[PDB]
Assembly symmetry: D2
Homo-oligomer: 95 residues x 4
C-alpha cells in the first residue's frame, strides 16, 4: 500500500485514513475493464475486502480517480467488518 496522501478519500475522512494506515496490510488495484477499477484491501489476517468503481464516460478514464473511488468503497465495507468485531471502537478512540 502507498502513502495515504495519494488518496483523496483518505484526506477527507479521518476514520478511513486511520483504518488504512493501521488495519490495512496490503492494498492492490487492478483495471479489469475499460471502465472499472477493482481495489482489494487485506487486514493482518489476509481477509480480503473488495471495492470497485466504474466511470460513466470511458474516454474520461483516469487511473488515479478510479483507484481512489474503488479504495473508498472498499474501506466502507471494511468499516462494516470493524463494526461487527467491535474493533471499530479501537479506531474511534485513536483519532
Amino acid at each position: 500500500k502507498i502513502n495515504a496522501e495519494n488518496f483523496e478519500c483518505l484526506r477527507e475522512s479521518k476514520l478511513k485514513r486511520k483504518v488504512y494506515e493501521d488495519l490495512v496490510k496490503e492494498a492492490t488495484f487492478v483495471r479489469v475493464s475499460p471502465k472499472s477499477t477493482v481495489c482489494v484491501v487485506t487486514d493482518h489476517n489476509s481477509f480480503e475486502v473488495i471495492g470497485t468503481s466504474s466511470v460513466y464516460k470511458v474516454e474520461n478514464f483516469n487511473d488515479e480517480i478510479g483507484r481512489d473511488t474503488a479504495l473508498s468503497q472498499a474501506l466502507d465495507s471494511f468499516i462494516k467488518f470493524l463494526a461487527y468485531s467491535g474493533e471499530l471502537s479501537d479506531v474511534l478512540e485513536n483519532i
Copy 2:
C-alpha cells in the same frame, strides 16, 4: 422457527447459522414490492437483506421473507468469514 423458511430447509449451512448464531430475524414490508429482513447476532450487530418482486401483483408475504432472509444470511456469512467463526459452523456441518 427455522422450519418455516424454505431457504433454511434447503441449506444446512444457513440453517446452522440461523439456529446457533442468529439472535433475532425481523421482517418489514417497506414498499409495494420490497421486503427487508434484519438479522441480528448475539451482540446485536445488524445484517440487512432485501428482496423485490418484479411484478407487484405477485407479491407474497412468505416468499418475500424467505428471499430477504436468504440474502441476509449470505451477508452474515461474510461477517462470519471475517471473524473466523464461519469455520466453527463448517466444523459442525
Copy 3:
C-alpha cells in the same frame, strides 16, 4: 418531501437534480434499533433501496439516518441512470 430538507441533496447538485426530476417518491422506515431503510421510487415504480446503520445505538438520530440512507439509495439509482443512459440527460441539465 422537499429536496432542501436533506443535507446530501444540498451538498450534491447531481443528487438533488435526480431527486427533483427523476424520483417519484422517497419513503423511510426504521427497520431496527440501528438501521434505517430508504426506498426511492422512479416514475415507473421501480424500487431502489438504500440503508444506513449507526454504530452506537444510543446515538440514533432520525434525520441523520434518513439522510445517509437516501444518499446511498441515490448512489444505486445513479447506476440505473447510467444503464439506461438517462444519466446523460441529467448531466446536461
Copy 4:
C-alpha cells in the same frame, strides 16, 4: 465463453437466457489469492461486476471461482433488466 461451461447457467434458464441474448462479453480476473472478479458487458458496453471469495485459499478452484463470480454478476444484471423492463422480454423466451 460458451454457456455450457458454467454450472450457474446450466441450472438457471433465466440466467442462461440472459447470458446468450443480452450479455456481449464476460471476462474473469483473479485479483487476489482468494477473490475472482467477473465483468459482464451488455451490447451497449455497460459493465456489471460480480465477485467471489473462497473462504479457504488452499481450496481455490478457477472453475468454481468464475462460476460463482458470474452468477453474482448476473444477479446484478437482472436488477438492471428489471429497471428498464427488459426482464419482461427475457421472460417471454423461457
